[PDB]
Amino acid sequence: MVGLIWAQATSGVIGRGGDIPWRLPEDQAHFREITMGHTIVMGRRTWDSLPAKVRPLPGRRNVVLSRQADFMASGAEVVGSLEEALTSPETWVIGGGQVYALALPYATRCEVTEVDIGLPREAGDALAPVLDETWRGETGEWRFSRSGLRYRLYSYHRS
Numbered sequence: 109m110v111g112l113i114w115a116q117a118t119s120g121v122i123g124r125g126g127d128i129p130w131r132l133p134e135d136q137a138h139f140r141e142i143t144m145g146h147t148i149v150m151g152r153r154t155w156d157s158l159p160a161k162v163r164p165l166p167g168r169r170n171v172v173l174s175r176q177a178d179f180m181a182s183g184a185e186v187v188g189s190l191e192e193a194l195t196s197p198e199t200w201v202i203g204g205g206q207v208y209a210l211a212l213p214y215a216t217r218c219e220v221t222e223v224d225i226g227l228p229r230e231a232g233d234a235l236a237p238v239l240d241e242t243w244r245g246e247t248g249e250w251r252f253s254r255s256g257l258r259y260r261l262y263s264y265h266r267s
């Protein structure tokens with residue numbers, strides 16, 4: 109099982125300036141619940157974006173994809189191809205834009221948080237992958253985050 113998990117603006121933006129232009133504590137808690145105990149696979153830029161406090165993210169096998177053969181990520185495994193990272197029964201791809209796109213053909217689940225923020229797409233933004241016909245979607249209801257933004261969770265799946 110390979111799943112992707114991400115939060116996006118309605119426009120599809122997931123990242124800007126190497127970070128994320130919002131933070132929803134309820135969404136991060138959901139992220140922790142879904143990924144805890146499992147493999148998480150991330151691009152090197154997303155590793156760099158993790159707060160030092162949660163590098164590596166606890167209770168998870170942290171795997172970092174990089175083309176730098178000697179890149180070191182303390183507490184993580186650094187691999188040079190995505191296939192090396194897919195050995196565990198449940199693997200969660202946690203971004204960013206490049207690695208979501210690379211992982212999508214392997215994926216059967218996407219856990220998507222849509223954030224009700226009006227953020228037009230800009231050059232250099234990281235974007236959510238596009239989910240075609242093969243994906244079946246189940247939406248939840250809109251919720252209010254203590255951060256002030258509304259959000260809702262989509263669970264997409266395919267065989």
Ligand SMILES: NC(=O)C1=CN([C@@H]2O[C@H](COP(=O)(O)OP(=O)(O)OC[C@H]3O[C@@H](n4cnc5c(N)ncnc54)[C@H](OP(=O)(O)O)[C@@H]3O)[C@@H](O)[C@H]2O)C=CC1
Nearest residue numbers: 114115123126127151152153154174175203204205206207
């Ligand atoms: N909203 C959300 O839910 C999330 C948002 N984000 C945001 O996304 C942005 C980062 O996404 P992005 O810029 O797309 O970068 P990624 O996080 O996708 O990492 C890109 C890097 O991964 C490595 N990589 C990519 N493809 C390959 C490959 N085929 N083989 C080997 N290594 C590879 C390279 O590392 P190297 O350069 O070391 O070779 C490349 O520079 C940040 O803004 C981050 O905050 C991230 C995760 C979730």
Ligand SMILES: Nc1nc(=O)c2c([nH]1)NCC(CNc1ccc(C(=O)N[C@@H](CCC(=O)O)C(=O)O)cc1)=N2
Nearest residue numbers: 113114115135136137139140158162165202203221
């Ligand atoms: N749905 C989703 N939202 C995100 O914000 C998100 C995502 N997916 N995938 C990757 C990603 C990259 N950034 C980050 C940043 C911080 C933490 C973090 O601190 N996580 C703690 C949260 C614990 C909690 O809040 O209860 C963890 O232990 O997972 C995780 C991912 N962020």
Ligand SMILES: [Co+2]
Nearest residue numbers: 141142143144
């Ligand atoms: Co689990």
Ligand SMILES: [Co+2]
Nearest residue numbers: 244245246265
């Ligand atoms: Co269903």
